[PDB]
């Protein structure tokens, strides 16, 4: 027989997938593309253009 204890001693001597939800960083640009904010495109005054004085 090989004396399995000797074999153990010899061994000791010798020795559905899917895209994981990875962390996503939110946008944090170093600078704003249009830092200077734009004024109201359609303010209250611009909503009403001209009065209508038709007799009807």
């Amino acid at each position: 027989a090989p004396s399995a204890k000797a074999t153990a001693a010899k061994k000791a001597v010798v020795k559905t997938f899917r895209l994981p939800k990875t962390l996503k960083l939110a946008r944090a640009p170093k600078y704003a593309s249009k830092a200077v904010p734009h004024y109201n495109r359609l303010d209250s005054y611009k909503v009403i253009e001209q009065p209508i004085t038709s007799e009807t």
Partner: protein, 55 residues
């Protein structure tokens, strides 16, 4: 050497005058297969200070 299996006899060559060993000795196993396996596994096994030699 008992880890590999049962050891029958072990003796060490010591100086007659001083108790220190001569760094060599002999030992016998109850099975020839175990003895040859141990020799193969320790044929050139590196040890502290010097590589062990077994035949």
């Amino acid at each position: 050497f008992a880890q590999f299996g049962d050891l029958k006899e072990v003796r060490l060559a010591r100086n007659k005058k001083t108790g220190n060993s001569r760094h060599y000795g002999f030992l016998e196993f109850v099975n020839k297969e175990d003895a040859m396996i141990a020799q193969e596994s320790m044929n050139n096994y590196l040890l502290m200070g010097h590589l062990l030699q077994v035949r």
